[PDB]
Design a protein around this ligand. Structure first.
Ligand SMILES: [Mg+2]
Ligand SMILES: [Mg+2]
Lengths: 417, 421
């Protein structure tokens, strides 16, 4: 039997230039797996050094030390294949709900590198090791193209405007459709002398005046690339509505939650939007109730800040009838075991799940494997530039090819266009 | 003995959203290596030529399914049965199979993909680090990076004539400290731009293209960024330029935006007196040989002078430049020549003539990190692989840091700029 023998960790930079860690788990046979940990811009504790003379306080040398001095003794000798056991051991070694003692980034690095070490030991694909023999669904992506809100200096209230290449027969064709719309948009922006520098996700933040102008521009880009909105490519939003919710007044840039729901409803009547993420604030439970009752029969309603990949919040959301899809960000919770339990709890209640990148990503592509492992049918992993995004699409295309006739590209949005 | 058994290739996207290929070389023992290829040139007489499909229905003609087909249908038969370790033999076989000087029949992208993937398969067979397989036991020098921060010319829509403004963290005791220095200056620069209401979206290389009016504004802004991050210009961090002067050279008038080659040299000399610039790339146009000699006579004893478009990683051009005394450092882009064997020979031939060599990224990169291993494999002492955001850039720095850590006491961070201090 193959057991954990050592764990190495080192400090790298993420795609924004800030430190994070990569972790290598090594078995007693000399097999190993390596994974790196992303980071967002309210969740499991990302442990930073706070040394002001180093990376403005964002080093992760202490988390690395926790991997090497705490998790190594806690895990060595245990089977490389007992994923749930290893994750429980780390959760207990930390002892706190939010992983604030050892660092959720230290624990997630080990959690992912361990699964890969086991898969590499069996010489089996990670998605098959994690998801079993019937892992076979390639996800329909939601692809960022235009940014606003807190992610821009334009007049867009909402944070992200995405396309979904819903008519693609394959993931690789979904990628091409996305890339061609991206190229048409880039050229449209150049022709309009609007900014073409890209943001964290690899899409654009031109100076547009309103959510509707952004939606119109994506429609123009779709058609210019030669595709039909609604039939070939639909739209999705991330409002990140907490960003413009006044908790004292209970208003969204002056509007009641009922007004805000009316605004989203009108957009959905006039645009081929089939998914809305965080349309109301994370704690506006009456708003979410009205949003779910008003559009939950017609459009995918995704909780991101509402759920934070957290099984307790998901269960409370489902009991109250809120939303119909869950964003899954493994580092928000900190182990694969808890990520899987979030996915299972949502899926058996009829919710879709969507594997998601973070704004600070790395060259690690685990979330592509996780999306296939759990047959989620959806992923959210960025625009069509910058290799910390593209590498996930490249990994999905490799998975689809490796699976040959077993692959199925299949959107899990219940309400597709 | 371990021989080449199969080669696979597949179509991926580069960091710009355009197609390229990854290649997997598989041995008869089942060991393998994988390598991906960055963006090149499809046309012209300067570089070895990458092969594009040119199908308007697919990725705007930029697919690479023909190159993938050449790997599987042409290179597999030419190479199977040969030893995985005979790197030179394999590269010679591929050069022959294509039959053209610029590799335009099979594609430089197909041939380089196999060339890199084969080296990786061999190193993985031996379970040895790639830089140790390619460069031997005394590969151990970590390169001083030149780190993009501000873009201009054809790579921007601002008032900067020059194309790239870079920093070099020359006082770093290690590559990982060089990375931290760069990242802290990058971050201070980003915050300065935010406070000045200037754009912070990034270009291909992961740096900024703010609306600045002149080269001097950009150079001054880098000085402020360095100091704001807590470092001292000249002593901790120097500056480097890529003028890309061919882009503003009028070939009929023989003028650089109205200036003779002598005037442009005078401009560069004034810049070097007033700023801590220790490296200039393509300061004059690629064929202005009188301009380049004068540049070499005026500054070639004081600052590094890089030929990129002057040399295009081509040994016959490098040899003729050295004979005429032009430049003192050479940019090395492996896909501009198309095999590892020719890359190593370009480096060797430049190096024994006293020229420094600088491994370089391309504007369309991938998550592949081979040029990091190559800079260390050949102990070049310098690399040019982008700004401090976007992981097709960062992954190279991350790989350099992994190499340095892996080497322990064997590692040496050492700048090869002849005008190092
Ligand atoms: Mg979100
Ligand atoms: Mg250049």
């Amino acid at each position: 039997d193959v057991v954990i023998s050592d764990i190495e960790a080192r400090e790298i930079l993420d795609s924004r230039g800030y430190p994070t860690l990569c972790v290598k788990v090594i078995t007693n046979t000399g097999t190993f797996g390596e994974a790196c940990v992303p980071s967002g811009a309210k969740e499991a504790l990302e442990l930073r050094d706070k040394d002001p003379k180093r990376y403005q306080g964002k080093g992760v040398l202490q988390a690395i030390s926790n991997v090497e001095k705490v998790l190594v003794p806690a895990l060595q000798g245990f089977s490389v294949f007992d994923q749930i056991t290893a994750d429980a051991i780390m959760i207990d070694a930390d002892g706190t709900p939010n992983k604030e003692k050892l660092g959720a980034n230290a624990i997630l690095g080990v959690s992912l590198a361990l699964a890969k070490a086991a898969a590499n030991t069996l010489q089996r694909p990670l998605y098959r090791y994690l998801g079993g023999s019937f892992s076979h669904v390639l996800p329909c992506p939601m692809m960022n193209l235009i940014n606003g809100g807190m992610h821009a200096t334009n007049g867009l209230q909402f944070q992200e405007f995405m396309i979904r290449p819903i008519s693609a027969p394959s993931l690789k064709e979904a990628v091409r459709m996305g890339a061609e719309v991206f190229n048409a948009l880039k050229k449209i922006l150049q022709n309009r002398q609007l900014a073409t520098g890209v943001g964290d996700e690899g899409g654009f933040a031109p100076n547009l005046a309103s959510n509707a102008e952004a939606l119109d521009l994506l429609l123009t880009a779709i058609e210019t690339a030669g595709f039909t909105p609604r039939e070939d490519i639909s739209l999705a939003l991330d409002c990140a509505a907490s960003s413009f919710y006044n908790t004292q007044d209970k208003t969204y840039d002056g509007k009641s939650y009922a007004d805000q729901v009316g605004i989203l409803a009108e957009l959905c009547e006039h645009y081929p939007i089939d998914s809305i993420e965080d349309g109301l604030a994370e704690e506006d439970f009456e708003g979410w109730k009205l949003l779910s009752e008003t559009l939950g029969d017609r459009v995918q309603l995704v909780g991101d800040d509402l759920f934070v990949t957290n099984s307790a919040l998901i269960a409370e959301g489902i009991a109250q009838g809120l939303a119909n899809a869950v964003l899954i960000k493994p580092n928000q919770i900190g182990t694969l075991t808890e990520t899987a339990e979030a996915i299972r709890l949502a899926t058996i209640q009829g919710y879709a799940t969507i594997l998601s990148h973070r704004s600070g990503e790395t060259e690690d592509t685990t979330i592509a494997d996780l999306a296939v492992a759990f047959n989620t049918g959806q992923i959210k992993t960025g625009s069509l530039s910058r290799s910390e995004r593209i590498a996930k699409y490249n990994r999905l295309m490799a998975i689809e090819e490796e699976m040959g006739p077993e692959a199925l590209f299949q959107d899990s949005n219940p309400f597709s266009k």
